[PDB]
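Example with several molecule types.
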Amino acid sequence: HMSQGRKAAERLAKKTVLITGASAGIGKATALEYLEASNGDMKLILAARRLEKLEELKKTIDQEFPNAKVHVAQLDITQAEKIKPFIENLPQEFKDIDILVNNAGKALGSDRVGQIATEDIQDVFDTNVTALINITQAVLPIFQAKNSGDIVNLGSIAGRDAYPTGSIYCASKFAVGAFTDSLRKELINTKIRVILIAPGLVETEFSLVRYRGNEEQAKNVYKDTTPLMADDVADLIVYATSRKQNTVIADTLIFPTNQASPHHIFRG
Amino acid sequence: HMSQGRKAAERLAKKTVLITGASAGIGKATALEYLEASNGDMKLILAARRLEKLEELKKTIDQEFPNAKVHVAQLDITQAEKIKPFIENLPQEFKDIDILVNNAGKALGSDRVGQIATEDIQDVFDTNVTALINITQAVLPIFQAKNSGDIVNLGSIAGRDAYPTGSIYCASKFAVGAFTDSLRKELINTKIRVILIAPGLVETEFSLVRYRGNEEQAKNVYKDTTPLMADDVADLIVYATSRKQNTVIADTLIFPTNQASPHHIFRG
Amino acid sequence: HMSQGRKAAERLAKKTVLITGASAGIGKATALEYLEASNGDMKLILAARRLEKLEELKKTIDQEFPNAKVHVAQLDITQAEKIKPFIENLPQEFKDIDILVNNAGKALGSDRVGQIATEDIQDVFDTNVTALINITQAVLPIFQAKNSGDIVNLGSIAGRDAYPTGSIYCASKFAVGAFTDSLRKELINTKIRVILIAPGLVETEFSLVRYRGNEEQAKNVYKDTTPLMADDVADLIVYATSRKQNTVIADTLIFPTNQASPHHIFRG
Amino acid sequence: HMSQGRKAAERLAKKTVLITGASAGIGKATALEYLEASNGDMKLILAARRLEKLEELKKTIDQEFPNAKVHVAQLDITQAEKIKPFIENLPQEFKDIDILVNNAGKALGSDRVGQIATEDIQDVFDTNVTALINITQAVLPIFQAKNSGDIVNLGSIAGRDAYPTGSIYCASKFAVGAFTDSLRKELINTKIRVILIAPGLVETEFSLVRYRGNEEQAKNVYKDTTPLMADDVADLIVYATSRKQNTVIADTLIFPTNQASPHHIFRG
Ligand SMILES: NC(=O)c1ccc[n+]([C@@H]2O[C@H](COP(=O)([O-])OP(=O)(O)OC[C@H]3O[C@@H](n4cnc5c(N)ncnc54)[C@H](OP(=O)(O)O)[C@@H]3O)[C@@H](O)[C@H]2O)c1
Ligand SMILES: NC(=O)c1ccc[n+]([C@@H]2O[C@H](COP(=O)([O-])OP(=O)(O)OC[C@H]3O[C@@H](n4cnc5c(N)ncnc54)[C@H](OP(=O)(O)O)[C@@H]3O)[C@@H](O)[C@H]2O)c1
Ligand SMILES: NC(=O)c1ccc[n+]([C@@H]2O[C@H](COP(=O)([O-])OP(=O)(O)OC[C@H]3O[C@@H](n4cnc5c(N)ncnc54)[C@H](OP(=O)(O)O)[C@@H]3O)[C@@H](O)[C@H]2O)c1
Ligand SMILES: NC(=O)c1ccc[n+]([C@@H]2O[C@H](COP(=O)([O-])OP(=O)(O)OC[C@H]3O[C@@H](n4cnc5c(N)ncnc54)[C@H](OP(=O)(O)O)[C@@H]3O)[C@@H](O)[C@H]2O)c1
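Resulting structure tokens for the full complex:
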């Protein structure tokens, strides 16, 4: 198991990764890809709300990667007050986080301004931005203590090119990008790496969530295109975080070949 | 009184402007400037938390511009549940808003990530982003009914060029920009104008608020420079909103001559 | 004649403006607008290739603004070797330039990459970028000697949001923006103002030139929209350059109300 | 020899890469890295002006990668008239290009506007922009005929964040980005991948060229930092081009850990 070559595996070995939104889509793919690239030799902290999904993943990992160690954690990152204790209370074995993947995130609906539910505004901002920042602040001290660690934030093409009907989501991803940029500028005197991942169309549960479980509307987003799959973004994240320390794959835009922006999507 | 020429005064006359953060700084300057440019002939809705400051402004206006009509409103735009009623309950005379100026906003501290108080995060985001969106959604129906109206959003240079120690503020201003951009893209089939104003250094109460009333630290931000004053930004706002309808001064970055970015500030 | 109010007229009076592309469209509008805003009391240096068009304009100005002084100059700004002498040889009366408007510019064709004529590539880059820089370098010493002066560069929405079929033009306008931004950052220790004007659809001779004189294709670009007219952009330029010296209207995107990007253009 | 894992080697095998600026720095590193990742099993066309440097590289490759096939080409990409014939005249074996790496490029001096030699302006633009576009147009038909191929353009952090003293270079890299973006938007209906690589500080011959051979000034750019080495950027290029076809690593900013922008560079 060395999906990315020997040197990348060496660099990943024995590191501890904390992944938010590990129950599905990119987060889940990323947990698996980290093992593919390191010959199973890492420690994973998988956090999301759906505990069974996490358990199921751990079981999959357990048999596929005997030498992997996985700590499953039911956490709604929206519940601010639980973040700091969550970190402080990690089992000894998993306390020394090396890579934080702020992947948990969502979009709710495609309403034009004027039609947007206040709940949808709070939920998207709280999950995408506020929680991302809380989790970041709670982990950072670990990195600063040892002057090492990667902070990986999931932005989006929507974070640099806004589109109509996506005002809130775009506002949230623009925010994530900016926060990420300040952070990188603050840390230039450390060896802590700050990495922004910005995908276009990836077929996950993202569109299913976005349209409240309506499978029709979800599949329709990808109709007549070959979008990215979660493992494609996972591939990039593991790639970025397995570079030699001095290298920062700082900001990457990943697209399916048929897409060039939110407004430029070829449908065959 | 026609600070911007006859034609601009004609275009402004008898319009109703709603201004958030009218008690100080740019919002206050903007109320005054609208009158300077329209020969007093407008209707102003001035909202902020400090009711006395608003009253004082109204009194100033009352004697300076007898023909102006001013409705003062004590409102904390952060109290979401009060927004919709606020708009619906405007006195008949002021109900027909023509220009919305989403000016109320703030920055809290200059802490590097890791050191940022959760209250400061919520306050900045709620005031700068969430409330701006709520207020925008509450007013927009008025504009859509009559297919006219200007939406003016206070962004910042910080909204397109992030800087260390300003992660939250920058994140919030990037969000305001992106929301604004989505909005403009949604409304291209209307005659509703969407305008983003993005200043650099303006000497107001902004730095005083930012450093919790410490006048030392506040004055220090402007030390050895000649920053913009609030009437400079007011000038631009009134300029943008007094153009003929078909013209959209969509996005303007305004700088004092000694500044070229958050990182490029000459001190004499 | 004070289209922009008294204070703006005072600030413009007796200043010397150098305008490239004065024979048509925005450049021509801008010469006229400067006079509207200053009560005719300025000195204009109008440069372009079509000498009769310039003469015609001067004649118009001569009778409309008796107190204006206009120096007409047949110049192909693409002829680098003539730039420095051009400046150095201005008649005494016009030597002390206060405002440079780098307006001359064009786009040639709408060919996709693979189909682009080399002549069209050189012409667009030489006029839009190289000449702009040459002219800028030649005038700048005047401004540095007296520590004042405005440099106005015509960018475009295309300079920040590229679009298919416009690769060369967009590349050129991105370049103009970047050059402009470096410049502003270099001059923060001077009182020299650096101003970028970025329009969307303006109906001038721009599309006519772009499609090699084919009036059909030209009119077609504006079909079913109400684009900006050249005086709209002139209005903005005169506005920016008539602000008090300390204020820099640094970067303004101006759109007709039906447009929000090169990709978002409503046609009624 | 599979620096990036088996699957990536499979995807690279037997492909033909054309590399500009192969005689040194990133271009040279990239030729080497392609072989490291594919077990020597590719065909390289190495072009630059210094023929001996190319020969030397080929000799290195010949003994290190017996199964590699290398065509060396003395070419000044600035000589436009030679581009099309260059492509058309490639030996049969190397005619079917799969990957174009537009790497040749340079910066000349660090002069502020006003002090910039016209030769330096033409040389930078002709090499970085005009030649890049010419070479792109000449190779593209190959890709369109077979509906596959990667176009890799070397941009820079300078292409999205301009800095004083780098106006021309920045202008040139902004143009490369914009051209690149247009190109990707044009090709969404093909399976041709369009990839922008944007590094910060890499220690190559780049600074040596920039300061006309002065080793002092060159080494000084990197003093007290650990910059990226050419093989770091090579790694990213090979990574991007060895993804499965549907995946486009569209736009990647790569930094040494001590850098976060042109203005944010920590020196230890
Ligand atoms: N997929 C795309 O096309 C797209 C494009 C660009 C960027 N992105 C970004 O990439 C990230 C991952 O998206 P995705 O496509 O993988 O979405 P997804 O398939 O819907 O998964 C999102 C994950 O986040 C978790 N999550 C949501 N809210 C949470 C909360 N309050 N607390 C803890 N965990 C929470 C979910 O698990 P539970 O429900 O079990 O808690 C789920 O596992 C998001 O930030 C998204 O914005 C997505
Ligand atoms: N100063 C700068 O250099 C700078 C630069 C770029 C952009 N801006 C932006 O310009 C806008 C105005 O800033 P400024 O410099 O004029 O600031 P300021 O002088 O401190 O005034 C801000 C106004 O907002 C009001 N406000 C704050 N929170 C409120 C709330 N929760 N509910 C209702 N009103 C509230 C305040 O009034 P009350 O306390 O009475 O409620 C105050 O009148 C902000 O959006 C700011 O981000 C400032
Ligand atoms: N119109 C739009 O939709 C649009 C949008 C954004 C930006 N812009 C920009 O705004 C500026 C002016 O546009 P426009 O609409 O006014 O175009 P226009 O109507 O074609 O006029 C351009 C002017 O430049 C002059 N000119 C062209 N090449 C020249 C050369 N080589 N040497 C000297 N003068 C030259 C032309 O005069 P002669 O032929 O007589 O020399 C003409 O006066 C340009 O930078 C353009 O890129 C236009
Ligand atoms: N180094 C950095 O910090 C950095 C950062 C961002 C982007 N970049 C970009 O990365 C690319 C490579 O730069 P580098 O650091 O590798 O520079 P480098 O070490 O100086 O190499 C540049 C290469 O380009 C070739 N070249 C220059 N002009 C040419 C011409 N007219 N025709 C054919 N070949 C030519 C040179 O070969 P000959 O002299 O033999 O012709 C040399 O092989 C450039 O596009 C650069 O702008 C560099």
